[PDB]
C-alpha cells in the first residue's frame, strides 16, 4: 500500500464498506483531529470517507514503515474486535449515565496501538 499511494483506488471497496474496516476508520477519523468522542458512533452504515483517507490513517497509525496489506488487515481487525468489545460493555453506557467518565476512549485506542504494536508488528 505504500507503493500504490505515491504512484496510483488500491484497497478493495467491498472491504471499505465492511464493518471491520469502517468502525476503526470511524473512530480514527474522529481521533486524528482532536474532536470530542462523547457522541455515539457506528450507526451501522458507511460515513463519508474515501479509500484514500482510510488507507492513509491505517498507514500512519499502524506504526511500522512499509507494511503489507495483511498487516493492515490484522491491525484493523484487532481494533475492530477491541472497539466492538468497547461498544458491547457498559462503560460507554455508564459514561453516558454518569458524565464524569469521558476521555477514556483516547486512552483505549492509544493503548490498543501499543498492544497491536506488540501483536501485529515485527520490525
Amino acid at each position: 500500500p505504500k507503493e500504490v499511494i505515491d504512484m496510483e483506488p488500491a484497497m478493495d471497496p467491498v472491504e471499505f464498506c465492511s464493518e471491520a474496516f469502517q468502525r476503526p476508520y470511524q473512530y480514527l477519523k474522529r481521533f486524528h483531529q482532536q474532536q470530542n468522542l462523547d457522541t455515539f458512533q457506528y450507526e451501522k452504515g458507511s460515513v463519508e470517507g474515501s479509500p484514500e483517507e482510510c488507507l492513509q490513517h491505517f498507514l500512519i497509525y499502524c506504526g511500522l514503515i512499509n507494511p503489507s496489506w495483511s498487516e493492515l488487515r490484522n491491525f484493523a481487525w484487532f481494533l475492530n474486535c477491541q472497539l466492538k468489545d468497547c461498544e458491547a460493555s457498559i462503560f460507554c453506557k455508564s459514561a453516558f449515565t454518569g458524565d464524569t467518565l469521558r476521555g477514556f476512549k483516547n486512552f483505549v485506542v492509544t493503548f490498543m496501538i501499543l498492544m497491536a504494536r506488540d501483536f501485529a508488528t515485527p520490525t
Binding site: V14, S68, W69
Partner: protein, 150 residues
C-alpha cells in the same frame, strides 16, 4: 539417435523441419555431442515486446464466444498475478474477478476452482488429476475460472 537413423534410412519426407535446443554449458553429455555437425551458430532470438504482443495476440479471445475472460483485460484468457513480496493483493484480486464474473452474465453459479500447488519439484500429474473430473463433463463448458496457486 538410432531411431532417428532408422527413420532416415527407411522412408521420410525430405522437407522436414527438425530443430533441437540444448543448454550450451552442458555439452559433455550425449545428444549435443553426437549431433555436433549440424550446429547452427546464430541462436535465433526475438525481442521482449514482440514476444509479449505475439502471445497476447493469440491469447485474445474474440467476442460473442461466452468466455470467462471478459472480466479480465478484455478477453485475454490467461493471466499471471505476481508480486515481489508475498501477502499483498493476489487472491483477493482473483476473487474480485470471480465476483465480477458473478455480476455480468447473471444467474451465475460459476465455479472458482482453486488448485494449490505446494510441493517441490512440481508434478504435473497433480494438476492433471485435479482437472480430469472437471471439464470431461460438458455441462461445465459454461465459463469457469481456474486459479492455479504455485
Amino acid at each position: 539417435e538410432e531411431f532417428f537413423q532408422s527413420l532416415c534410412t527407411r522412408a521420410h519426407r525430405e522437407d522436414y523441419q527438425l530443430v533441437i535446443l540444448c543448454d550450451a554449458a552442458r555439452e559433455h553429455c550425449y545428444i549435443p555431442s553426437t549431433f555436433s555437425q549440424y550446429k547452427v551458430p546464430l541462436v535465433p532470438q526475438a525481442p521482449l515486446p514482440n514476444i509479449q504482443a505475439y502471445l497476447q495476440s493469440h491469447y485474445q479471445v474474440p467476442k460473442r464466444l461466452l468466455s470467462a475472460a471478459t472480466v479480465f483485460r478484455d478477453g485475454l484468457c490467461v493471466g499471471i498475478v505476481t508480486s515481489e513480496r508475498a501477502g499483498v493483493g493476489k487472491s483477493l484480486y482473483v476473487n474480485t474477478l470471480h465476483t465480477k464474473l458473478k455480476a455480468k452474465l447473471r444467474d451465475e453459479t460459476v465455479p472458482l476452482k482453486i488448485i494449490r500447488l505446494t510441493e517441490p519439484h512440481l508434478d504435473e500429474n497433480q494438476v492433471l488429476s485435479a482437472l480430469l473430473p472437471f471439464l470431461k463433463e460438458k455441462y461445465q463448458k459454461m465459463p469457469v475460472i481456474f486459479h492455479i496457486d504455485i
